[PDB]
């Protein structure tokens, strides 16, 4: 009926990790984010680059401002910390799974903070590094973060998978399992 939409600029700086991120969000999806390290604009979908541009330094600048402000906030609260909020982890196929037909496993990491996590994809109990990918820390409607990890795989009755997520809020690493079921 009506063209309702939301555009969001999300940025932060984290200590003691010294991590920072800057990104735009359109109706819940990432338009692009800036690599505070490579001072580079990285579009979520390559095709977006043909329709717009965005200067990375200006983003590193904004991050610098968050870094300075973070120190003030630390002074203003007397370095009083909050408890870590562990994430909910879900592993699902990106699309219907058919044997022998290459698909994608999605490791959805939701409702956590701080925005730092260690994710390990496991195939038949073995660490996997080929064909894995990931998004940056995305925003939610509250103060927590969400994030996606991906694993390209060949559908088989044989292999089984596990997405292992470790976070400061978790006693022991969390591992979600996934296997094929015709």
């Amino acid at each position: 009926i009506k063209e309702e939409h939301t555009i969001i600029q999300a940025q932060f700086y984290l200590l003691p990790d010294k991590r920072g991120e800057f990104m735009f969000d359109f109706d819940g999806d990432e338009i692009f984010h800036v690599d505070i390290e490579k001072s580079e604009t990285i579009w979520r979908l390559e095709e977006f680059a043909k329709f717009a541009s965005f200067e990375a330094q200006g983003a590193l600048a904004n991050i610098a401002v968050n870094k300075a402000n973070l120190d003030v906030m630390k002074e203003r609260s007397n370095n009083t910390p909050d408890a870590n909020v562990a994430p909910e982890v879900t592993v699902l196929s990106r699309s219907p799974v058919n044997l022998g037909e290459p698909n994608i496993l999605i490791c959805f990491i939701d409702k956590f903070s701080p925005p730092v996590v260690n994710v390990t994809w496991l195939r038949n109990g073995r660490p996997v590094t080929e064909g894995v990918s990931e998004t940056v820390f995305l925003p939610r409607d509250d103060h927590l973060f969400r994030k996606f990890h991906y694993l390209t795989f060949l559908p088989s009755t044989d292999d089984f998978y596990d997405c292992e997520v470790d976070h400061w809020g978790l006693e022991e690493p969390l591992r979600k399992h996934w296997e094929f079921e015709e």
Binding site: R44, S53, N69, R76, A83, N84, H143, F148, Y150, G169
Partner: protein, 216 residues
């Protein structure tokens, strides 16, 4: 310029309003400190109506916000108080912030209106049954709709031409993180050899409704 995305300008915080902190109390939990800000441009019928909402978080609490319909910063918690008083006494800054609704929101909106707002990706519909040779309760007919965009979609089930409106379960709209959505709209029924089921899916990327038929 109308091809260069503009970023919201963040203000600098100052001294004052120091607090005992208190906190929650972890003890063993590793300490972390996060300065997090989100600037949200809310659009109603395009650029017709726009509301800017900036939200500041320190660790797990929101402590300050700037609502374009309010026009000034307002503390959400004690911690955000010094910044409101400080930034609200800066007329030049408040003037710039108030205009970001145009210099940033509407501005960026018009750029995105050329490839994001119109984006459309037609869904792939497939139908199939589940729970056979391993389960005892009630079969289920699954209507799988994957890889579509935008998110709003309508799926309906049909038995022998007559629509069903009960025994309908769904995994709901699932966002995949790569600009596509996926979902499962299941019908709870017991398939009988002489029956024909139909899954009808309505999506803005489709001229007319799509329909997949299934028989046992």
């Amino acid at each position: 310029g109308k091809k260069v995305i503009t970023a919201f300008n963040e203000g600098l915080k100052g001294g004052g309003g120091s607090l005992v902190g208190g906190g929650s109390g972890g003890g063993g939990s590793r300490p972390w400190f996060l300065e997090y800000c989100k600037s949200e441009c809310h659009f109603y019928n395009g650029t017709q109506r726009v509301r800017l909402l900036v939200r500041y978080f320190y660790n797990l609490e929101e402590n300050l916000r700037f609502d374009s319909d309010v026009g000034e910063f307002r503390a959400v918690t004690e911690l955000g108080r010094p910044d409101a008083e400080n930034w609200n006494s800066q007329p030049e800054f408040l003037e710039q912030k108030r205009a970001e609704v145009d210099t940033v929101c509407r501005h960026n909106y018009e750029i995105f209106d050329n490839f994001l707002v119109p984006r459309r990706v037609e869904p792939t519909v497939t139908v199939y049954p589940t729970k056979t040779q391993p389960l005892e309760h009630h079969n289920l007919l699954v209507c799988s709709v994957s890889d579509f965009y935008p998110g709003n979609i309508e799926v309906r089930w049909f038995r022998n031409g007559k629509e069903e409106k009960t025994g309908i379960v769904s995994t709901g709209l699932v966002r995949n993180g790569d600009w596509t959505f996926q979902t499962l709209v299941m019908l709870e029924t017991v398939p009988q050899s002489g029956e024909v089921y139909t899954c009808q899916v309505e999506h803005p990327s489709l001229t007319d409704p799509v329909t997949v038929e299934w028989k046992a």
